[PDB]
């Protein structure tokens, strides 16, 4: 009832016209699926209550989880939302505050896990991602994000009140991953870092929820998306996700994506079929290595979330899954 | 300082491209510039002999402690970003909790005496009215004015160790001020709250007839229109370019006359009420009522910036006579209150 009241007060404070009239009992505040970091509520005026002008009838209230409440995250996620709103690349911004946001509600659905593998959607996702990778954003251009964030998470985990750090020798393995990636060139671009089905709205596509975004290796954004082909978070029973490791894209599926990615990335350039096939081959290898970083990143994240999050989800189980999959794919690279 | 130079170098290198990633710290020119009384400002440029591969120069603005609170940080960051996207402010090249990297706009700030020039005063009024018409993603309730003053008063009361709070009976006077303004209606609009000559840039190569740019929305919020106008009028009195301590000069007789106020007000209303058909008697009533509104909300400018300046005496690292300035503001508050009773 106090998340209910807080929602009312935020709407009344930031929104105009009829929202200043609506009574606590009138206001419809429904929890909606917001993912595994933040809370999301759909707030809507009574059906009967007339508008004064062009105020929205419905908005989304998004509240940051603890893992996204750091001052650096707050600045980035607040400015990125505002910028994309101004550029019509995201939902309009009605209220912005340290705790969260009031956003435009866009009639849409998110994609489903199995839809990521359809060749037309997959091409569209690769094109959209290349578009974002071409953008200049006012954040550090140095790729500190990946290992900087993992080292932070590792330290926070160790300082918290089954021991996955010991079982999987994560401190040592992070050094091994660092070394592997040092030997794998990957261009630094503005990355979303979380391009899963729930962040891709079918309107035709809008990519949303840039909370994890930063300049990072191109291979991470691609590899990470590919990892997401495996994980379905709509599963109704604990741990509330289902993994299907065989759903990871085949070499054919990866190539299809990579071809449409590079079509947008290298738009206008004229490249021989030799050059083109080399770009494709090189990016396939780049991606197979940076995919490992997706597993490791989100594994560490999920361990920390088991203690920081209030969302009902099998965080430790999910972490186990990611680290198991990390080692599997590392085993497959060696062969 | 040598640490300030190195930090500036590192911000530029980390956020900017091309030659910024090649220039060595010995070669980057970092210049301290007039930043005002809240934030530090540095103009950073590539040496003339280092060709580009990107801006040749940028400004690095670092928030003072009074602007480092999370609420302030979200507002000031997002506001700069929005205004950039709308071509209402400089472009944003870097944004972080400590400050920003901004496009350098060829310009100069206005001077105190230039605020009284009829053509510039009219352009300031128009631009202020334009901002007052905008919708921004911040709370629409006018909590800012007394909410911030209340916060400042409480923080001042907990500062370690003459006592201006006692001398001028500021705790009781805030209540008197609240009571006066409660009875003085003023439309709640998106306000800048710091429209002083230092924040009004005369563009050196304007592309159109808008030859001014209003910058530095760090204190911005929904607020009473009378405050934004009144505060601007108060700024006609204070010149912060004075080169010896306390680094400002006050000229109370420079406060705008009724005719100077009305000139501003006419151009403000012309923009604010653009399109609306108003009779001679309707216009004159709007103008007359606004003079009274502004006379009262001007008192809030003195009281706000007086409180701010006591706090800054402790919080700021900028060399300025913050206590001497606080005294000036509170003296003028009472002077003007004394003039209203008449």
From Swiss-Prot, chain B:
Result of altering residue 329 to L: In MDCMC; decreased choline kinase activity
Entry-linked InterPro entries: Kinase-like_dom_sf
Amino-acid positions noted as binding phosphocholine in the UniProt annotation, renumbered to this chain: 36-38
Top class in the EC scheme: transferase
Coiled coil: none
Reactions this protein catalyses: choline + ATP = phosphocholine + ADP + H(+); ethanolamine + ATP = phosphoethanolamine + ADP + H(+)
Classification via SUPFAM superfamilies: Protein kinase-like (PK-like) (SSF56112)
Pathway, per record: Phospholipid metabolism; phosphatidylethanolamine biosynthesis; phosphatidylethanolamine from ethanolamine: step 1/3
Any one GO molecular function term: choline kinase activity
Keyword Transferase carried by entry: yes
Subunit details: Homodimer, and heterodimer with CHKA.
Protein family membership: Belongs to the choline/ethanolamine kinase family.
Functional summary from the UniProt entry: Has a key role in phospholipid metabolism, and catalyzes the first step of phosphatidylethanolamine and phosphatidylcholine biosynthesis.
Illness: Muscular dystrophy, congenital, megaconial type: An autosomal recessive, congenital muscular dystrophy characterized by early-onset muscle wasting, intellectual disability, and dilated cardiomyopathy in half of affected individuals. Some patients may die from cardiomyopathy in the first or second decade of life. Muscle biopsy shows peculiar enlarged mitochondria that are prevalent toward the periphery of the fibers but are sparse in the center.
Protein name: Choline/ethanolamine kinase
Gene behind the chain: CHKB
């Amino acid at each position: 009832r106090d998340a209910e009241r807080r929602a009312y007060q935020w709407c009344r404070e930031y929104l105009g016209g009829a929202w200043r009239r609506v009574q606590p009992e009138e206001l419809r505040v429904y929890p909606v699926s917001g993912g595994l970091s933040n809370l999301l509520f759909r707030c809507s005026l009574p059906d009967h209550l007339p508008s004064v002008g062009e105020e929205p009838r419905e908005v989304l209230l998004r509240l940051y989880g603890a893992i996204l409440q750091g001052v650096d995250s707050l600045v980035l996620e607040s400015v990125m939302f505002a910028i994309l709103a101004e550029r019509s690349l995201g939902p309009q911004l009605y209220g912005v505050f340290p705790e969260g946001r009031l956003e435009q509600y866009i009639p849409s659905r998110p994609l489903k896990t199995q839809e990521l593998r359809e060749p037309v959607l997959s091409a569209a996702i690769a094109t959209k991602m290349a578009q974002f990778h071409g953008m200049e954003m006012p954040f550090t251009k140095e790729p500190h994000w990946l290992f900087g964030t993992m080292e932070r998470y590792l330290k926070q985990i160790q300082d918290l009140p089954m021991n996955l750090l010991e079982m999987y020798s994560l401190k040592d393995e992070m050094g091994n991953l660092r070394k592997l990636l040092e030997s794998t060139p990957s261009p630094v671009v503005f990355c979303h870092n979380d391009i899963q089905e729930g962040n891709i709205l079918l309107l035709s596509l809008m990519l949303v929820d840039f909370e994890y975004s930063s300049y990072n290796y191109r291979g991470f954004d691609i590899g990470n998306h590919f990892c997401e082909w495996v994980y379905d978070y709509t599963h109704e029973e604990w741990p509330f996700y289902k993994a299907r490791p065989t759903d990871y894209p085949t070499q054919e599926q990866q190539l299809h994506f990579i071809r449409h990615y590079l079509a947008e990335a290298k738009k206008g350039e004229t490249l021989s079929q030799e050059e083109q096939r080399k770009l494709e081959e090189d990016l396939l290898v780049e991606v197979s290595r940076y995919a490992l970083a997706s597993h490791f990143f989100w594994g560490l994240w999920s361990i920390l979330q088991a203690s920081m999050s209030t969302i009902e989800f099998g965080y430790l189980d999910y972490a186990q899954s990611r680290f198991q999959f990390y080692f599997q794919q590392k085993g497959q690279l060696t062969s």
